[PDB]
Design an enzyme around this catalytic site. Structure first.
Site, mmCIF file in Angstrom:
data_model
loop_
_atom_site.group_PDB
_atom_site.id
_atom_site.type_symbol
_atom_site.label_atom_id
_atom_site.label_comp_id
_atom_site.label_asym_id
_atom_site.label_seq_id
_atom_site.Cartn_x
_atom_site.Cartn_y
_atom_site.Cartn_z
ATOM 1 N N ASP A 50 0.821 -1.310 -0.010
ATOM 2 C CA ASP A 50 -0.149 -0.025 -0.047
ATOM 3 C C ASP A 50 1.337 1.069 0.013
ATOM 4 O OD1 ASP A 50 -1.846 2.090 0.456
ATOM 5 O OD2 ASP A 50 -2.334 1.542 2.454
ATOM 6 N N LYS A 55 3.100 11.495 -3.462
ATOM 7 C CA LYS A 55 1.724 11.057 -4.041
ATOM 8 C C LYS A 55 0.816 12.027 -4.640
ATOM 9 C CE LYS A 55 -1.555 7.286 -3.358
ATOM 10 N NZ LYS A 55 -2.153 6.468 -2.408
ATOM 11 N N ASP A 113 -13.017 5.203 2.718
ATOM 12 C CA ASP A 113 -11.545 5.084 2.922
ATOM 13 C C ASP A 113 -11.423 6.655 3.755
ATOM 14 O OD1 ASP A 113 -8.953 5.218 3.286
ATOM 15 O OD2 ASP A 113 -8.550 4.207 1.489
ATOM 16 N N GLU A 160 -7.051 0.993 -4.504
ATOM 17 C CA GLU A 160 -7.105 0.768 -3.329
ATOM 18 C C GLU A 160 -8.401 0.288 -2.908
ATOM 19 O OE1 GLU A 160 -5.576 4.681 -2.207
ATOM 20 O OE2 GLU A 160 -3.773 4.312 -3.002
#
Lengths: 177, 376
Positions: free
Chosen positions: B5, B66, B194, B170
């Site tokens: 992850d 990211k 999430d 994800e």
């Protein structure tokens, strides 16, 4: 030696014992005439449960003093609970002591910074900065420690050590810019 | 083979061994590792060691890479984010690069190069555990990533010496962790909620005979747990002012301390109904010994918390689905531990039980690792 009279049910047992003894030894002397293991004995003196670690004379116990004995079949639960508090109090205190030793060492550098300056030398702003943040890290560690009583007094004194060393470092930085 | 992850603030690596996934702890014993790379005049740090010296060396400690991957320097969001990051971002023919001082020189790195460094560490964490080199991996990305963003993430793996078996979403990774694809029969609609790592993503998937399809994504790229800590911090700044007629807000050291104490209190309030806060000599020698109820914490965040249902609604509408057509709800992300979050979501799904037993910080790597085992 002294005479202590312990009531257990309706029976009173008289125990001859030295006034310097701990309550633990008194309990041990009681196992004989009562059959109760010492770890299983709850001793009441003047309406107060007496810790085995406490001493008779300090506690007020005199010749002919009266106590009560109560058996606790759940003593082990109570011993582990108490050990848990003791262990937690110790861990926090030792955590602050370790930080205290790191604070000694950082303070060693602050003091050496002061001396160098007093003696005509110069310390790089970067080195002053580094020690300020190393000190802030120790402060943050201190804030993480849950504490009460003497251990909190310990925590607060280390915080004050840190804040003083930083105030000094700040004064140096200002002096040099 | 491992699943990784690759998260915006932290990353996590799992490996499927002996018919079971193990999530792997790093050297400090942590099952997640900060997605942080720091540069000094002597060395280059990655992970915990990088995050740990951040206050020390802030303009040379890179994170949030990211948020740049696959972006254009021009992008409004990039130009906006740059004003908040302490490290630099420069333009390389339209492409963003982070810029730092390394061993005295000025160096710049593509977002993927920084990610390759995080991946290498996640790799090494696993290898360290297995006593054997690791060559193959599945790496995850958010569902809304485009082929450009996906490719860059893959290249990051490649540079790190990983054969990336596959890049998967994800939310899909999370659904896999919970075996939802093996709930055989009619197609299933899955909502992945999430909330974590400084972002909030709602995803809707349909699974049909173990084939996954993303029906819609929604959320807020700048909502996370720090927002909640901030409301607590400001609350306490106010409290200090009502109690000592002093405004600590300008003293950075005091704010740092209160912020850090507030982060702790928040976690404590996930499992207790009250938390105690003690900061000795916070400001001008004034101790701060106070506390906060879960209830008061919820109140301070009432709008933020409620507002997480808005992307849930947008994602439903865009999928052409009514809440009632959702067969599976999945909670992932550190912040979904907040009871009030869980309640708001369940209530909104009229009582339906949430999939949440898997550690929310780990579910994604867990799903990634399962998939890696299947693909190898």
């Amino acid at each position: 030696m002294i005479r202590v009279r312990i009531k257990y049910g309706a029976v009173y047992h008289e125990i001859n014992i030295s006034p310097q003894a701990s309550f633990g030894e008194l309990k041990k002397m009681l196992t004989g005439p009562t059959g109760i293991h010492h770890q299983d004995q709850k001793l009441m003196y003047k309406d107060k449960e007496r810790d085995s670690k406490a001493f008779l004379d300090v506690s007020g116990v005199k010749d002919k003093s009266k106590m009560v004995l109560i058996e606790d079949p759940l003593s082990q639960e109570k011993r582990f609970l108490e050990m848990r508090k003791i262990a937690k109090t110790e861990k926090a205190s030792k955590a602050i002591s370790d930080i205290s030793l790191e604070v000694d060492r950082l303070g060693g550098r602050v003091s050496a910074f002061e001396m160098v300056t007093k003696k005509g030398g110069k310390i790089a702003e970067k080195d002053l900065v580094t020690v300020i943040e190393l000190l802030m890290n120790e402060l943050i560690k201190l804030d993480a420690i849950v504490a009460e009583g003497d251990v909190k007094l310990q925590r607060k004194m280390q915080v004050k050590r840190v804040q003083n060393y930083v105030e000094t470092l700040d004064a140096l930085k200002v002096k040099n810019s | 083979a491992v699943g990784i992850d690759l998260g915006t603030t932290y990353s996590c690596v799992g490996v499927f061994q002996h018919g079971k996934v193990e999530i792997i702890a790093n050297d400090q014993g942590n099952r997640t590792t900060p997605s942080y790379v720091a540069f000094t005049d002597t060395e280059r740090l990655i992970g915990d060691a990088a995050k740990n010296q951040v206050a020390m060396n802030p303009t040379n400690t890179v994170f949030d890479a990211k948020r740049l991957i696959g972006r254009r320097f021009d992008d409004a969001v990039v130009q906006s984010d740059m004003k908040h990051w302490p490290f630099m971002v420069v333009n390389d023919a339209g492409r963003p690069k982070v810029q730092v001082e390394y061993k005295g020189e000025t160096k710049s790195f593509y977002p993927e190069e920084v990610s390759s460094m995080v991946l290498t560490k996640m790799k090494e964490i696993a290898e360290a555990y297995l006593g054997k080199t690791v060559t193959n991996a599945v790496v995850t990305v958010p569902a809304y990533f485009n082929d450009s963003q996906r490719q860059a993430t893959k290249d990051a793996g490649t540079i790190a010496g990983l054969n990336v078996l596959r890049i998967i979403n994800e939310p899909t990774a999370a659904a896999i962790a919970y075996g939802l694809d093996k709930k055989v029969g009619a197609e299933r609609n899955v909502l992945i909620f999430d909330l974590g790592g400084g972002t909030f993503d709602v995803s809707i998937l349909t699974i049909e005979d173990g084939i996954f399809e993303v029906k819609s994504t929604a959320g807020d790229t700048h909502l996370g747990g720090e927002d909640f800590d901030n409301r607590m911090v400001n609350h306490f700044i106010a409290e200090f002012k009502r109690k000592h007629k002093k405004d600590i807000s300008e003293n950075k050291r005091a704010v740092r301390r209160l912020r850090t104490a507030c982060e702790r209190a928040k976690r404590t309030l996930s499992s207790s109904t009250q938390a105690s806060i003690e900061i000795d000599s916070l400001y001008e020698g004034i101790d701060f010994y106070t506390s906060i109820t879960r209830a008061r914490f919820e109140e301070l965040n009432a709008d933020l918390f409620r507002g997480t249902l808005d992307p849930v609604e947008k994602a439903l509408r865009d999928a052409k689905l009514d809440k009632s057509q959702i067969h599976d709800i999945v909670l992932v992300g550190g912040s979904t531990r907040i009871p009030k979050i869980q309640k708001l979501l369940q209530d909104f799904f009229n009582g339906k039980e949430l999939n949440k037993s898997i550690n929310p910080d780990e579910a994604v790597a867990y799903g990634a690792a399962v998939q890696a085992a299947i693909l190898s």
